[PDB]
Amino acid sequence: QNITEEFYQTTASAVSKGYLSALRTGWYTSVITIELSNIKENKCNGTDAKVKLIKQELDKYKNAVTDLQLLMQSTGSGSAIASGVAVCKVLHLEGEVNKIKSALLSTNKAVVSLSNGVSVLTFKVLDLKNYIDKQLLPILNKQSCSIPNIETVIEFQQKNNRLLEITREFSVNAGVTTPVSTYMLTNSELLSLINDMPITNDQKKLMSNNVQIVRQQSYSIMCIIKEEVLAYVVQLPLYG
């Protein structure tokens, strides 16, 4: 007799699931990118605890990258994610990934015209290469490993945690996840994407007020790792 299961429910709002799904008229696809460091396993004189912890965190960084590389090689028309899948194909066209990277070199957001006709908003939500190439490359790219003070270990785990969780969600879901978690797209990132969507301001108010409901109506789709860029497509509903 519990009719609540037929309703999206948040702390302040509820929406009928069938009514919301029926109102959908299209999909909006965005490209979410994480900048990665292409670093091989460097072996040097590692004795103390802090070096072990960094290399253990580094190993998990390497495993997550290789796991996602196996996903992109792994993984139409009538599918619920056919919109996002089509965008992934364009990203596989040689030259698109560098185009997205060039536009995100100075900002974490930029509108990019692909080489199929679609203009797609692109985000860079995490810059791991910048952190690794400036805080860890000087320490470990040596004959004898440098000593990273224990707070550097904590910082790197903080930043690396998001990549591991994203890899974990993609691995157990075979590359397609719903609802879109806060690790795929934080609330701040999701609200920013909504504000730049080609919809009305009232629609932006509707989605911004109900971010949790938007997550349950959206998909996150793994696309590619290429040229130090991890790219996945977030597919958001359009009610127009």
Residue pair 147/48 in contact by the 8 Å Cβ criterion? yes
Q: What are phi and psi of 100, to 5 degrees?
A: -65, -40
CB 35 within 8 A of CB 124: yes
In sequence order, the β-bridge partners of residue 122 are 31, 110
Q: Which residues contact 43 (CB under 8 A, 6 or more apart)?
A: none
CA distance 137 to 54: 11
DSSP H helices, 104-210, are: 128-131, 137-140, 150-172, 187-195, 201-209
**15: which 2 tokens?**
């929406």
Residue with tokens 């985000």, as numbered in its chain:
123
End-to-end CA distance of the chain: 33
Q: Distance (Å, rounded) from C-alpha 113 to C-alpha 111?
A: 7
Strand, helix or coil for residue 11: coil
**Residues contacting 118, CB < 8 A, separation 6+:** 29, 87, 90
Method: X-ray
Cα separation, 12 vs 24, in Å, equals 22
Q: Where are the alpha helices (DSSP H) in 74-186?
A: 82-92, 96-103, 128-131, 137-140, 150-172
- What's at 48, amino acid-wise? D
Tokens of 55: 């290399």
Cα distances from 187 to residues 124, 183, 190, in angstroms, run: 15, 9, 5
Query: CA–CA separation, 98 vs 91, rounded Å?
Result: 10
For residue 179, how many other CB atoms are within 10 A of its CB? 15
Both tokens of 102, joined, read 């060039």
Secondary structure letter of residue 220 according to DSSP: E
- Which letter, b or e, does each residue of 81-104 get, where b requires 16 or more Cβ atoms within 10 Å of its Cβ? bebbbbbbebbeeeebbebbbebb
- Resolution of this model in Å is 2.1
Count of CA atoms in the C-beta half-sphere (13 A) of 203: 15
